[PDB]
Design a protein around this ligand. Structure first.
Ligand SMILES: O=C(O)[C@@](O)(COP(=O)(O)O)[C@H](O)[C@H](O)COP(=O)(O)O
Ligand SMILES: O=C(O)[C@@](O)(COP(=O)(O)O)[C@H](O)[C@H](O)COP(=O)(O)O
Ligand SMILES: O=C(O)[C@@](O)(COP(=O)(O)O)[C@H](O)[C@H](O)COP(=O)(O)O
Ligand SMILES: [Mg+2]
Ligand SMILES: [Mg+2]
Ligand SMILES: [Mg+2]
Ligand SMILES: [Mg+2]
Lengths: 122, 464, 465, 119, 228, 117, 122
């Protein structure tokens, strides 16, 4: 019988219960996003989690928005390009978490979102 | 210096040299100590534990002034003819009490001291309520004079009647009984004290049919009528809900069981009745659980003063001659405490303290329980005009039914009033006055025949 | 048959010794002392009649309804052992006679007028069998034992409280100071005295502000959840609710009410408010001994205790047995079980006249308070067990070193008793040794033990079974 | 479907489908939030949400309900829920359950860093 | 010890020796199991899944007492003349139910069990509602006797009439029809069940004209009238 | 063929998230993900509180199973045909999932539906 | 006259005002739990006390729940076994407080609860 850990295992939503994603793993999620005809976008933050500082009413949390890296990559057809931008974001903000998202503008919702970089010690 | 440990209560709370202040609340306790406990210590324990003290010395007494706040036993006297019994007098500073709260007053004076192991028995006989405290209470929503003025009734006791059987009648039968009684000459009918809302009859249905009956009897007779609709309930919200519907119906009077509902609810209801023009009849259900025995409990005169403070326009005060106990001299004493403005100390009537009400309205005493037409002269002589005389069985038990039973009681009462006014002595000529009215009232004659041999003669349990 | 006007004996209609009680009936056991000349059957019938459907003369309106369905009935009379003129008369009341959810209505019938009848010399209501069909119409305790322990995270030992003293006369700021010092020494609770409501020397809202400050300061210092029972008892229902609303605003865990002096209608309203607002409700039984002290007349506390579990309270005082107020041991254990347990079988050796089934109504925590001190800790722990609150007012503020040391002495004494009991020691026989042994570890306990070693309250109880 | 299913002239009747015209559906509010909004409020995208009904269905105390809830949410579920028949009962009154489950939701959310809920 | 995994419902929820308590809610279910499912297991699944159980063993049963709370199938009998059909009797402890809530009672007894794959059909035939539970409900606002007393009508069935056509009449025509019916001798008329508030007739207009009709017919006939 | 008798136009009324619940466990994760897709809530009551190690491990088993199914699907694996292999592969990484898989490997609910098109 | 300390004496409910429990003391409390037929369970936390972060309404506090170590020990008849699990919990979480509780499933409430391990410096 194993006890689920209580510390050092904070999570980041989808895919965060699997082993760390390799570069090929990240590429395959980006290829899926692109074949599905979704728009990729990178976002980043030095704070990794939600909190409730300004309000505690239903459905209000702070920390859900992270900062947009440049603009969504409209017209992108190459997963490699998305990886290049991820590399530029980590170089610019090595102490920030970086996530990759993908959205469908018809239904207007994000269809995929995962952490692609965590700063050293996080 | 603070000295921890236990010392006798009398060292701080027995103060025989104390001169009472006009602002103090005074209490007269009949105390029976356990063997070996000096009466001074028993009286001091009662004063301490109903005011500021506890069983061991506390350093926090030094943050305040016990001289200013302590209750104090200032006089103790043995009761002649009793073994090991004393009247201990305790004075409580005005500042000890929450304004307008009979609940708070009782919580201090009778909250914990009756259970002390060092006492065998304890009875609170009387309280001197100073004007400085009574002025913080609304008192009766209306009072005697205003009630007579609203109902246009003068010159005789009012007449009422509790509907029977006590429980088990439907709403529609309740209104039927009410209408027949009121149309025969009674001023009021009433819900029994335990008629609240039950499977056999829900309150709102009863209120609708009794209003219909009050207005039908009033239209037929031309005299203002009422039926006391009971607001007594399990919660304060339900009690107010019932009073609000009586207000909507426009009726003149509601009732409340002040001790079983309680003083916090009763005081709220008295304020609502004052603000909405409703007379408030008070039933004293459960009082005899507290006030029957001479050795222990609280005498009814204390419960009577507490009601005049919390608020009520009528309160039951006994019959003396009916089915429930009520010694005559002590009853005359608390009837004066309920109606008068100033009642002088009179131990022959159990009035231990002079009581000054500084214009608080008087409460109409209600004589009810086991009375009938032959009692009319005595009741009129004992209570006088400012009373309500109620005949439940004495109306619904008439052989010809409710309207004739009500007419028999109304005729008996008016014959007594006329005789009294002419100078006849009701105490000596009452039977002759009733027999003379039987010459022209077949209804009264029928009632007189049924109840002529009925008398309730038992030795009272409490004597002065 | 025809209506026949006139008087007849109550026993012709209301004494029914052949009646078999129904599981929906409310049963009452009355200790009745008739006047000389009144047969016991007539005394018992009069009590049944006049607490249910009858009056003193025959009324024709009985024919509109069914007395067979509604009358109260005296179904058994038994002489009292050792008495020449006292009896226990048993009366059954149909369920339909009562208003659902209203203790006020129940008492108005059963004890409303019969105690004043001329034909009786004395009357005492000893017990009531409350059927499940009637108790289910009541909310009962706002929380109950389990829930209260879960809210406060307190398990494994009696809770410890303390009434601030002097009873009256302290300012709001001094009340909060006394409260903080007591709670920080180890008590779980302190409380307003029963008569501390709002007065010239201390208005309630000021007391509520400073006591909340004290509760939160002591909780932050000790790391244990603390409470101070703030008294909502007041002169009117609107003032009572106003006080409870401000305690809710302050976020505190517990308030108190004097259910008999405020009354059942107000108490029931407050219990509903407390359930709807998450407030524990401590009930003080002020004035109960006016009613329940004497064996010959009144109402036994066990009836008042059942009535409070119905009207609603999370705690109720139940006596100490060993302190300054009377409380005979066996009858106390009997009503402690009536307050806490789900099913209490008839047991006349503990004054339980009827089997009482609460059908999962929550239990109420009994509170032992009044003239107790550290040397009583073993006996109290043995009598009441863990589900109890033990309160030391004078036993804390009377410690020679002040409140925090006085609280620590009581907390240490209690924990030493719990540890010893759990290891298998006999508290009833080794209590003094267990307390002495803890004195080695606790100078605060040693000082309390020295001051109160000679203090005992030994008087013969007035009420005995 | 008010009365026609009881007609003597029929042996059986089943309503299979209804065509709700836009002119009538526009008179309804419909979902308080809906799929997109809910995902946006909770910041959850890219996978089904995961929930769990606490068991035994009935019989657990409020404090044990919150304990079960905390342990489930901290292991990775987005939600737990009251069973459909858990309303307010002698073994567990609703307001006590709401207090302990809120404590559980917030403790598991603080530990995991993911938004949590308990219906 | 806690033993994870699936076991038959009948091991815990089929209790043929159980004697029902006067406080229990009892249900009589007409159950048609799928082929291969023993009737005892079908009855036990219905009792379990309408009370305390689920499909696999949960350790949390140990925090409480299933003996106190479980629903239990205490009797099963075949239905004569039917194939593969049984009446299964289930007893539910009083504590399982929210006082005063028919919604809660139905949520447990008929909430999920009618859709179990292991059953072909299920019908709830009767429920024994114990006095301890029914006393927590208000019940009828008035009831038979009070209604007759309020309307002063005794000695015969009351007479009513639903206005027709069911839908499509205006408020004013509704009141016209109501008045003509009541004045001829009916005690009541009524809105059809589907007459609520619609484009052809809004409710508040109907309420105004029907009140006018109730009072006109009452004044003309001298008998108390109503329109639901 | 899917019992839709009428064309239904919701004119932008928001959608409702369907919830799959009742007797499901880790081995069902691929089929549930394939049937419902991402816009769904999958609920495991007995499938969590019935885990041999308790609730947090039971939740972790379900979360890992679901994430492994999502990752495999996104990479192009056929959930309808490779589900058991995808779940087994995740058992290497998750002792909690391995334990759930062992307890419920033989549990399937296969009965003929009463309502068929 | 001694002044009750204001710091360094934070408390942990039942038994925390007595001297530190020895291993034999802990064993005797566990034997009492088992003879009484209660179920033992261990819980642990890196935060030792309650606080009020999410709400301040009556009866709401955070920090009352700690984390469950494995599952309650249903069927346990050996106090030694409970001590072995306590040792495993301290080895796994040396910086956590560990408490032992015992419950009665009939009344459904905890009947005993005490701290069995405090991390160094607490
Ligand atoms: O319930 C009753 O017995 C009565 O209705 C009287 O009925 P009858 O008129 O038929 O006797 C009264 O409430 C009592 O008088 C109350 O006693 P008291 O006035 O002493 O408080
Ligand atoms: O006012 C008092 O005397 C107390 O505050 C105790 O003070 P000490 O702790 O200083 O004695 C309590 O209210 C009594 O215990 C009430 O009696 P009971 O519990 O019997 O109802
Ligand atoms: O009560 C139950 O059985 C559940 O809590 C599932 O428990 P498990 O997760 O332990 O099976 C759900 O409410 C059902 O899924 C409802 O059925 P449906 O979703 O078909 O409406
Ligand atoms: Mg009466
Ligand atoms: Mg006190
Ligand atoms: Mg469910
Ligand atoms: Mg119709």
């Amino acid at each position: 019988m194993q006890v689920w850990p209580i510390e050092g295992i904070k999570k980041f939503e989808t895919l965060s219960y699997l082993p760390p994603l390799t570069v090929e793993d990240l590429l395959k999620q980006i290829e899926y996003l692109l074949r599905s005809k979704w728009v990729p976008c990178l976002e980043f933050s030095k704070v990794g989690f939600v909190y409730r500082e300004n309000h505690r009413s239903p459905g209000y949390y702070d920390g859900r928005y992270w900062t947009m890296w440049k603009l969504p990559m409209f017209g992108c057809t190459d997963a490699t390009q998305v990886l290049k931008e991820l590399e530029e974001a980590k170089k610019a903000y090595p102490d920030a978490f970086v996530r990759i998202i993908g959205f469908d503008n018809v239904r207007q919702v994000q269809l995929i979102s995962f952490i692609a970089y965590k700063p050293p010690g996080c | 210096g603070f000295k921890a440990g236990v010392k006798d209560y009398k060292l701080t709370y027995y103060t025989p040299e104390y001169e009472t202040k006009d602002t103090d609340i005074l209490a007269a306790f009949r105390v029976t100590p356990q063997p070996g406990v000096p009466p001074e210590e028993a009286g001091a324990a009662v004063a301490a534990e109903s005011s500021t003290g506890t069983w061991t010395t506390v350093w926090t007494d030094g943050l305040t002034s016990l001289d200013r706040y302590k209750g104090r036993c200032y006089h103790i006297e043995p009761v002649v003819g009793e073994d090991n019994q004393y009247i201990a007098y305790v004075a409580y500073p005005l500042d000890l009490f929450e304004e307008g709260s009979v609940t708070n007053m009782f919580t201090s004076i009778v909250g914990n001291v009756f259970g002390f192991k060092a006492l065998r028995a304890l009875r609170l006989e009387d309280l001197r309520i100073p004007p400085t405290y009574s002025k913080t209470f609304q008192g009766p929503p209306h009072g005697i004079q205003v009630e007579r003025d609203k109902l246009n009734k003068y010159g005789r006791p009012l007449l009422g009647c509790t509907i029977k059987p006590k429980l088990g009648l439907s709403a529609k039968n309740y209104g039927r009984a009410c209408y027949e009684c009121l149309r025969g000459g009674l001023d009021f009918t009433k819900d029994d004290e335990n008629v609240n809302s039950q499977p056999f009859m829900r309150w709102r249905d009863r209120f609708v049919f009794c209003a219909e009956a009050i207005y039908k009897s009033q239209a037929e007779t031309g005299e203002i009528k009422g039926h006391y609709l009971n607001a007594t309930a399990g919660t304060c919200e339900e009690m107010i809900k019932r009073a609000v519907f009586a207000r909507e119906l426009g009726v003149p009077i509601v009732m409340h069981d002040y001790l079983t509902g309680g003083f916090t609810a009763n005081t709220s209801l008295a304020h609502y009745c004052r603000d909405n023009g409703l007379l408030l009849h008070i039933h004293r259900a459960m009082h005899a659980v507290i006030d029957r025995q001479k050795n222990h409990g609280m005498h009814f005169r204390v419960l009577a003063k507490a009601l005049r403070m919390s608020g009520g326009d009528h309160i039951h005060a006994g019959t003396v001659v009916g089915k429930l106990e009520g010694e005559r001299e002590m009853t005359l004493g608390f009837v004066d405490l309920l109606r008068d403005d100033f009642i002088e100390k009179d131990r022959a009537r159990g009035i231990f303290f002079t009581q000054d009400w500084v214009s608080m309205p008087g409460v109409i005493p209600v004589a009810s329980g086991g009375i009938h037409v032959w009692h009319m002269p005595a009741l009129t002589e004992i209570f006088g005009d400012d009373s309500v005389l109620q005949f439940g069985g004495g109306t619904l038990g008439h052989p010809w039914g409710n309207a004739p039973g009500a007419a028999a009681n109304r005729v008996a009462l008016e014959a007594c009033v006329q005789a009294r006014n002419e100078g006849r002595d009701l105490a000596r000529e009452g039977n002759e006055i009733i027999r003379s009215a039987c010459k022209w009232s077949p209804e009264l004659a029928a009632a007189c025949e049924i109840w002529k041999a009925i008398k309730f003669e038992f030795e009272p349990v409490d004597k002065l």
